[PDB]
C-alpha cells in the first residue's frame, strides 16, 4: 500500500501556500552537495502526510526534484525507466510543435540539475530559506534560473490568469482519495513510481517518487479577452455574456468552475463551487449521438482534450473511468503580475504572466507528453467524430506558431471553424524526478 510519509507533498496534495519559488540549480561539487542534501534538505522536505494535516503545515514547505543530468552528477547511473526523462525536455520540444529557440535559455539544454520548490505564505520566508541553502551548500549548489509564483488575489484565488477556477479535477488514487462524483479512479502506480500497478520496474530507492513536468506557459490575457469579444456568438444577451460563453466553450468550464457539459448556455456559479457536483459528467447525453453532438461541449474544449471521458469508451453514466493510465496530477500556480489597467485598455500584453505548470505522473509518455502531443495537438482527436476534424485545443494546442484551427466552438453550427492565435506561449521547462523522501538522505546522498 501507499506510504505517504515518504512521498513528497506537492505530488499528491500541493503546497497550498500563497507564494512559491521554483529554484533551478546546478550541482558543482557532488561531495559537498551530498553532505548538505542529507543534513540540510532532507529533514525539511514536506511529505504528503505532513501537508494533508491542517495542523502540520510548515512555515516553508520544500520539495526537491532532480533532472537526468542532476542524477548523473550525483553518481546515480540507474535506469529510472523513463526515456523522456532521461533525454530531457529540450530534446522533446519538437514533439509539441514548438522550438527551444523560443525558450528561457537555461531550459534549452541540460545544465539544470534540479529544482527546489519553496512555498510559504510570504516571499520573505522563502528568501530566508534560499539564503540558508546558499550559505550551507556554498558553491556546491548554484542557481541557474528561478521563477516566482503566487495564488491570485481576492476572489480570483485559485483561478488561473485567464480567470477560470483551476485545480478542480484530479485523478483519485484508489485506496488513498475518497472519490468525488465523476472523478476518475486510478491505481497509485499511474502517479507514483513503483506503487500499485506501475508496470515499469524501478530502482528500489526510487519507489515512492514521481516525474515532474515543469512548463513556463505565458498567457496573453488582454489578447484572449479581446478575441472573445470580437468572436462572440450572436444571441440576445450582452456582448460580454456572449463572449464569456465562447471562453467557456474553449475551456469546457465557465470561470466559476461550472462544467459546460452540465450547463451549456449559461453559468451556474453554485454548481461551480460544489465539488460534489462540478465533476459529475461524462460528455454522454441520452438522446444525442456522442460522435456528432457538440451542443453541450465542443470536442475541442480543453478539458475534453485532456480527459476525454466517454470519448474513449467506458461508462456513459458517471463515473467514467476511461484512460486512467493517461491521468496527471496538477500542481501548477500562476506567475507574473496581475493585468494592469493600461494593458487591459490597450488589449495588449506588456509584462509576462502565466502558469507555472507542474504535472506529476509515473510515466511521462502516458501523462503530460501524451496529452500535449497525441490529444491536444492532434486535429483528429478525439477519434470517431463528425466532422472528423476536431481541431486543436484552443488553450494549449500548438502547431509551430501557426494560428490553430479549432472546430465546434460555436453552438449554432458545429461545422463552423475558427482560426485562433496562440494565447498560451511556451517558454520551455524541464523533466525532473521527485524522489521519495528516503532517497534524499539515502541513495542520493551516498
Binding site for ligand HEM (CB under 6 A): 160, 162, 164, 166-169, 215, 217, 219, 251, 253, 302-303, 306-307, 328, 354-355, 357, 359, 368, 371-372, 395-396, 424
Q: Between 137 and 432, whose beta carbon lies closer to ligand HEM?
A: 432
- Least CB distance to ligand HEM at residue 283 (A): 10
> Residues 83, 95: contact at Cβ < 8 Å?
no
* Cell numbers at 11, concatenated: 505530488
Q: Between 94 and 415, whose beta carbon lies closer to ligand HEM?
A: 94
Q: Using the 8-state DSSP alphabet, how is residue 147 labeled? A: E
Can you list the alpha helix ranges (DSSP code H) found in 171-294?
Answer: 221-230, 239-251, 269-273
Q: Which of 182, 411, 156, 130 is nearest to 298 (CA)?
A: 411
- Least CB distance to ligand HEM at residue 205 (A): 28
- CB within 8 Å of 409: residues ≥ 6 apart: 246, 249, 250, 298, 300, 394, 416, 418
| Angle between helical axes of 221-230 and 239-251 (0-180°, round to 10) | 120
Q: Name the catalytic one among 166, 198, 244, 261.
A: 166
Q: Between 24 and 162, whose beta carbon lies closer to ligand HEM?
A: 162
CA dihedral over 268, 272, 276, 278, signed as positive or negative: positive
- Whether residue 166 lies in the annotated active site: yes
Q: Between 212 and 217, whose beta carbon lies closer to ligand HEM?
A: 217
> Residues 397, 420: contact at Cβ < 8 Å?
no
302 is in an annotated binding site: yes
Q: What whole-number distance in Å separates Cα of residue 220 and Cα of residue 161?
A: 9
Task: Report how far Cα 291 is from the mean position of its chain's Cα atoms.
Answer: 28
- Least CB distance to ligand HEM at residue 255 (A): 8
Q: Which residues are the active-site residues?
A: 166
Known binding residues for heme: 302
Amino acid at each position: 500500500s501507499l506510504n505517504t510519509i515518504d512521498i513528497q507533498g506537492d505530488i499528491l496534495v500541493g503546497m497550498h501556500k500563497q507564494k512559491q519559488l521554483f529554484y533551478f540549480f546546478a550541482i558543482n561539487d557532488p561531495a559537498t552537495f551530498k553532505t548538505h542534501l542529507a543534513s540540510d534538505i532532507a529533514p525539511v522536505v514536506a511529505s504528503v502526510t505532513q501537508l494533508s494535516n491542517v495542523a502540520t503545515q510548515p512555515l516553508v514547505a520544500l520539495n526537491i526534484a532532480f533532472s537526468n543530468t542532476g542524477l548523473l552528477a550525483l553518481g546515480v547511473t540507474d535506469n529510472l525507466g523513463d526515456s523522456l526523462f532521461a533525454n530531457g525536455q529540450a530534446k522533446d520540444a519538437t514533439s509539441f510543435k514548438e522550438s527551444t529557440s523560443s525558450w528561457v535559455p537555461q531550459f534549452a539544454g541540460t545544465g539544470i540539475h534540479g529544482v527546489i520548490i519553496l512555498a510559504s505564505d510570504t516571499t520573505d520566508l522563502i528568501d530566508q530559506q534560499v539564503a540558508s541553502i546558499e550559505s550551507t551548500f556554498g558553491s556546491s549548489i548554484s542557481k541557474l534560473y528561478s521563477l516566482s509564483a503566487s495564488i491570485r488575489p481576492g476572489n480570483e484565488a485559485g483561478h488561473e490568469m485567464f480567470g477560470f477556477l483551476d485545480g478542480i479535477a484530479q485523478p483519485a488514487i484508489n485506496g488513498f482519495n475518497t472519490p468525488l462524483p465523476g472523478q476518475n479512479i486510478v491505481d497509485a502506480g499511474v502517479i507514483i513510481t513503483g506503487a500499485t500497478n506501475d508496470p515499469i520496474t524501478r530502482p528500489s530507492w526510487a519507489v515512492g517518487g514521481s516525474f515532474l513536468a515543469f512548463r513556463q506557459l505565458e498567457q496573453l490575457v488582454p489578447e484572449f479577452n479581446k478575441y472573445l469579444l470580437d468572436n462572440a456568438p450572436a444571441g440576445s444577451g450582452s456582448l460580454q455574456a456572449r463572449a464569456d460563453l465562447l471562453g467557456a466553450r474553449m475551456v469546457g468550464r465557465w470561470k466559476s468552475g461550472a462544467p459546460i457539459d452540465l450547463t451549456p448556455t449559461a453559468d451556474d456559479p453554485a454548481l461551480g463551487a460544489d465539488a460534489q457536483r462540478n465533476n459529475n459528467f461524462t460528455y454522454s447525453h441520452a438522446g444525442f449521438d456522442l460522435g456528432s453532438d457538440q451542443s453541450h461541449c465542443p470536442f475541442s474544449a480543453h478539458i475534453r482534450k485532456t480527459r476525454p471521458r466517454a470519448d474513449l469508451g467506458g461508462s456513459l453514466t458517471p463515473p467514467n473511468l476511461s484512460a486512467g493510465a493517461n491521468s496527471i496530477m496538477r500542481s501548477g500556480i500562476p506567475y507574473g503580475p496581475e493585468v494592469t489597467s493600461a494593458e487591459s485598455a490597450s488589449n495588449t500584453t506588456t509584462q509576462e504572466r502565466g502558469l507555472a505548470g507542474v504535472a506529476y505522473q509515473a510515466q511521462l509518455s502516458q501523462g503530460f507528453h501524451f496529452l500535449q502531443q497525441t490529444w491536444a495537438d492532434n486535429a483528429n482527436f478525439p477519434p470517431g467524430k463528425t466532422p472528423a476534424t476536431v481541431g486543436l485545443d484552443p488553450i494549449i494546442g500548438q502547431n509551430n506558431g501557426q494560428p490553430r484551427v479549432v472546430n465546434g466552438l460555436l453552438p449554432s453550427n458545429s461545422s463552423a471553424s475558427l482560426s485562433i492565435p496562440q494565447f498560451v506561449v511556451s517558454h520551455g521547462g524541464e523533466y525532473f524526478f521527485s524522489p521519495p523522501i528516503s532517497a534524499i538522505g539515502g541513495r542520493l546522498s551516498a
